[PDB]
Homo-oligomer: 322 residues x 4
C-alpha cells in the first residue's frame, strides 16, 4: 500500500463543487492586488485566475499557492481556458489591452466564456473606461442589470474619504462623503452629503465646494483626480488601493451584507437620463449583486454634470459594434 493509504482511510471520493468561488480575469498589478486582498479577507473557498500570458499566469498562481499555509482558501487554480472558472459566484474583470475599442474587443472574447462556465455569477468590472466596459459586459452577457457591477466611483470615494480624514484628523471610516457619476476626471463630489457624525459640513460652511470657499475644499476632489495621476507618475501603475476597494465590494456580495457602495449601475430613468448608460450611484450590494439603489438629491449643477457624462458615454456607446 502507498504511504497515503497507510496513513489515511477514505470514507468517500464523491464529486464536489466550490460553494464560494471567485474568479479574477487579468493577472496584472490590479488583478493580483484584488487576488491577495480577497485571499487575506477569507472571502472564497476557491480562487481561479485567468490571463492570456501563460507563463506569468502560472508563476502568479504558484506564488499564491506557496503561501497556502497562511491562508484559508484551500484551492487556487489558473488557466487560459475558462473551464477553471466554472461555478464562480463572482467574476472580477481586470483584463486590459482607441483604448475603448481594444478593451471592447477583449470583452467580446472574455464575457461569453465567463457566462458559459458561470451563468449565475455576478460580474464585477474594474477594467477602464469602467462605465463603458460595464455597459459592454451587460450587453454581451445578457445578464439582468443587478448582476453587472462596475467598480465605478468606489476608489474615487475611498480616496476622497482618506483626504477628508487627513484634513479633519479623523479615521476615513468616520468621514462620510460621496463621489458619484462618471469614474475618473469627470466624477462629482456630492458636497451636501459630506459629514462627520451626521453633522453636515455644507450646513456649517455654506461656501463648501464653491470658488468663494476660503479653505478651498474643492481641492479635496481635485486631489482625488491629481493623486491618481501622481501615483502613475511615481510607480508606473496603481494596485494596492484598487485591490482593497474591490475586496470590500467582494465582501458585501459574498456575505450578502446589503451595505451601500458607490458603484456603476444602469442609471436610465434618473436625472433626466433616457439612455442605456452606467454611472455610479450608491447601491445596496448583496448575494444578488445590486438589489437596490439610493436616489440622491442632487443640485442643478450636479444633475447637469451626470447628464453631460451620460450624453458623452451614450455618444461613444451608440457607435459600438458587437
Amino acid at each position: 500500500a502507498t504511504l497515503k493509504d497507510q496513513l489515511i482511510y477514505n470514507l468517500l471520493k464523491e464529486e464536489q463543487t466550490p460553494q464560494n468561488k471567485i474568479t479574477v480575469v487579468g493577472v496584472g498589478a490590479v488583478g493580483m492586488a484584488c487576488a491577495i486582498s480577497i485571499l487575506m479577507k477569507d472571502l472564497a473557498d476557491e480562487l481561479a485566475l485567468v490571463d492570456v500570458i501563460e507563463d506569468k499566469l502560472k508563476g502568479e498562481m504558484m506564488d499564491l499557492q506557496h503561501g497556502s499555509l497562511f491562508l484559508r482558501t484551500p484551492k487556487i487554480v489558473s488557466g487560459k481556458d475558462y473551464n477553471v472558472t466554472a461555478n464562480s459566484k463572482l467574476v472580477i474583470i481586470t483584463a486590459g489591452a482607441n483604448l475603448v475599442q481594444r478593451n471592447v474587443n477583449i470583452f467580446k472574447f472574455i464575457i461569453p466564456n465567463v457566462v458559459k462556465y458561470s451563468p449565475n455569477c455576478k460580474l464585477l468590472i474594474v477594467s477602464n473606461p469602467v462605465d463603458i466596459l460595464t455597459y459592454v459586459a451587460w450587453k454581451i452577457s445578457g445578464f439582468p442589470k443587478n448582476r453587472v457591477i462596475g467598480s465605478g466611483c468606489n476608489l474615487d470615494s475611498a480616496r476622497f474619504r482618506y483626504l477628508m480624514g487627513e484634513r479633519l484628523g479623523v479615521h476615513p471610516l468616520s468621514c462620510h462623503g460621496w463621489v458619484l457619476g462618471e469614474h475618473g476626471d469627470s466624477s462629482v463630489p456630492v458636497w451636501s452629503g459630506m459629514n462627520v457624525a451626521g453633522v453636515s459640513l455644507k450646513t456649517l460652511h455654506p461656501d463648501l465646494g464653491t470658488d468663494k470657499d476660503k479653505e478651498q475644499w474643492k481641492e479635496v476632489h481635485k486631489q482625488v483626480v491629481e493623486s491618481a495621476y501622481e501615483v502613475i507618475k511615481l510607480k508606473g501603475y496603481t494596485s494596492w488601493a484598487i485591490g482593497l476597494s474591490v475586496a470590500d465590494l467582494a465582501e458585501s456580495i459574498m456575505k450578502n451584507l446589503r451595505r451601500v457602495h458607490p458603484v456603476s449601475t444602469m442609471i436610465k430613468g434618473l436625472y433626466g437620463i433616457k439612455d442605456d448608460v452606467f454611472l455610479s450611484v450608491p447601491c445596496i450590494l448583496g448575494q444578488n449583486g445590486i438589489s437596490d439603489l439610493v436616489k440622491v438629491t442632487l443640485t442643478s449643477e450636479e444633475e447637469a454634470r451626470l447628464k453631460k457624462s451620460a450624453d458623452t458615454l451614450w455618444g461613444i456607446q451608440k457607435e459600438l459594434q458587437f
Copy 2:
C-alpha cells in the same frame, strides 16, 4: 474659526509615540508584499517604508494610504531619511543587490542601513529577508551590536511553508495539518527533517522507513527537491517571487508583535550546536515573541543531517571571515 474648529473641539494636542510601529526597508516586490500582508493582518498602528528610489517610494506610500478606508493602520509614512522609522518595534530588511563580490555589495548596503536603523530604533527586533539571508543576518548582527535574540533571519520559514504546501497536495490535507520542518541553510542546501514529518502526530518515517532515501519507491525526497525547483520555476515564470514570502514574513511579524511564542523555522546564532563552533546563523525551530528569539527547539538530527548543517556552517564561515566591515 476654520471648518475643522467649528466641527471639532480638541481636548488635548498631546501626540504620543507610536506603540506598535513596523518599518519595511526596501519597497521592491518583496517589501511591498510584506507591507500589504502586515496591513491586512492589523499588526501595526504605524507603518514606515524606506528606500533609496524616492519616486517609487512615494508612489508606493500614497497607493497604500489611498486604501486607508479599508484598513486599521491609521498612519503610513515613508522617506529616504531614517527619522521616519523612529521607535519601530520591528524593522524588516528586504534591501539588497562573482559570489563573494555580491555578498560584499550587500554588506556595503547593510553598512549604511543598519546604523541608521539602530540610531532611530535602538530597542527594535531586526528581521532580515535579503539574500543570502543566513550571511546577511550575521552581518546585521555584527553591525548592529544587538543581542542574538533581537536579530532574526527569515531563513527556512518559506522553505518549510512550501514543503507543507507540497506535502498537503500529496496527502489531500490542508498544509495547516501537514507538519514538516526544513532546517539549516536557506535555499539549495536546506535540510528536510524526515523524522518530524507527520499528520496528527503519526510519523510518516515510522510508517514508511524508506521516507527521504534514494531507495524510496514513492520518492518523497522529490517533495524537498520541489521546494528548491518551485522557487526557480516562479522566477523563470514571473521574474521574481513576492506573495509567499510576504505572507510568511507577516506570520513571523504576528508572533513578534503579539508576543505569541509560536515556533517558527527562522535563522538564529547556531554556535554551540551540531559541533558548530563558528559565528554562523542557520535555521532551527525558534520560539518567537516580544523580545524576538527567546528560545530554540533542540531537534534530534541523524548523523547525515548533522553533517549537512556542519558543512553549511563551514561554507558560511568561509565567506564571512573574508567580508570587509
Copy 3:
C-alpha cells in the same frame, strides 16, 4: 535535567510585561460578553479579570484559558487583588448591583474599585459600562483624578447601535450603511438626532419633513421609542442583556487599542456645551484613540434637542450633588 530543558534551549530568561493589556472588572453576563468579544477581536496580548466572587472568577478565567488554542491572546489572568491588573492600557468597569439608594451602592463599589485601578494602572483609559453610566462615569472621573480624556462612559453607544439596527430593518439596508445618532443621557431620556439620520449622505429629515414628529404617518419616533422598549423587552425575555453590549464595548476597545480615531457616541464631560455649567457626563460623538477622547464633534442641535440635554444635565447634577464620596 527536565523534558522541557531537553526539548528547549533558553537564550534569555528576561521578565517581560504586556504591551497591550486590557482589564475587565466584573465577570457577570456583561463583563464576560465584553471579554469574549475582545478576545475574538485580538485586541489584547493579556487579559485580566477582577471580581469579588472568587469561585465564579476562577471558573470564568479557566473556561477562557481552555479555548487558548483558538485565540491569539497568550495570557489570561484573574484575581480579587488588583495587582493582576498592573500596566493595563484599558480598564473596563462592568461591576455593580429606591433608585437613589441604588446609585449610592454603586458609588460605594466605585470608592473601592477606582483607587485600586489607578494604583496599578495610573496611565490607563477607564471605560465605564455599569449603570447609571452617566453618573458612574462622573464618579470614576472624580475618584480617579484622571484628565477628562481618559474617562469614557459607554453612554449612548449601544442606544445608537440599536437605533441603526431598527433603521436598517425598516429600510432593508445593513446597519453599517444606516447613519443615525442617539445622544445625551443613556437610556429613557436619550435624544435621537433626526437631522443627522441618513443613508449615503441623503438626509431622511430633508426627504420626510415630518420625521421624528407626532404628525409623521410612518411614526419614525417609534424607532427611538423601540430602542428604549427593546432594552426592557430583552430583560423580560432572557433576564439580562449581554451580547449587544459586549460587541459595542469591543468596538470602543478597538478604536482605543489601535488608535483608530473613529467617532463613537460615548459619555464625556459636557460642561461648556449646550448651556451646561455642571460637572456632568453626556453622550456626544467623540474621536477615540490611544489617549481616549482626544476630541469631540460639536453637533448642531435644535432648540428642543438642546433643552432636553440641559434638562438631563440638571437632573444628573441634582443626583450627583447629593452623593457621598
Copy 4:
C-alpha cells in the same frame, strides 16, 4: 410614497434560498457560546436558533440582532418551529436534558433527539449534523440512526475540546503557544479519553522519544497529570461557575470553520469507528478526521499501542452496551 420608496429604487424583490446557513439547536450557555463564536468568525450568512423555551429564544435572538452593526451575518432568525432552519448547510445540536441511572439520562436525551432530528432532516435533508449534547459519542450514534444520513454527514464534537485543553496545559508547561504544542486525545469523550503519548511533539520532536517514561506512572515529571488535569479541569469549571461555555463554543466554531470553508484540516471528532481497533459494533469514537464541505471525508489511521487499543475497545463495548438497550 413611503420614505423607503422615496429613498430607494428596488431592482428586484427576489430572495435566494439560504447559501451559507448554520442552525444552532438549544440556546443554553453552550448553544449561545457556539452562536457568538460563529458570528464573530463570519462563518454564516444566516444564523437560525431553535429551542422549546420560546421567551428565552426570542430574547437571545434580539440580543444578537442588536449587535448587528458589529457583525457581518446579515440575517439572524429564531423559532420553536423548524421552518426557520430550512436549507442549513450545518446544524449544531446542543439541546440536552439528582442522581439518575446511566441509561436513564441517555434515554431522556434520546427522547429529545426523537423530536429534533426528524424535524432537522425535514427542513435541511442535505445538511451536516454536528452533535455537542452529552453523552456525545452515544448521541452522535442516535442522530445517525434517526436521521438515516451517511456516516460522513454525522459528526460528534467528541475529543475536540479534550485535545484543546490538553494542548493548553502542554503549552503552559513548555512556555509555548498551544498552536505549536501538538498532542491528540482520542476515543471516548470525557473521563475515558485516551492521550496518544507517541504523537505529543513540538516542531516534529517526539516528547516520548526524548522522555521514554512520558505518560507512565513511573514518570518523575508526571506528564500523565496533563491528561488527568484535562478531566479534572472540566469538573473544576462546573464546580466554580456551574457550567462550561466559552471553550466549547470556540472549539465548535473551529469545526464549523473547516466544514463551511471546506478546509480539509484534521480534527479529533467522533466518527463511526466500526472496522478499526478490533471494534465490530456501530459506535462513534474520536479519531483525527479530515473535515470539509461533505463533513468527514477521511480519517487518519493512528498507530496505537496495545494499551491504547484496549482502552478504545473497552469504550466501544461500554457504548454499545448502552446503545443496544435504547428505545427508538
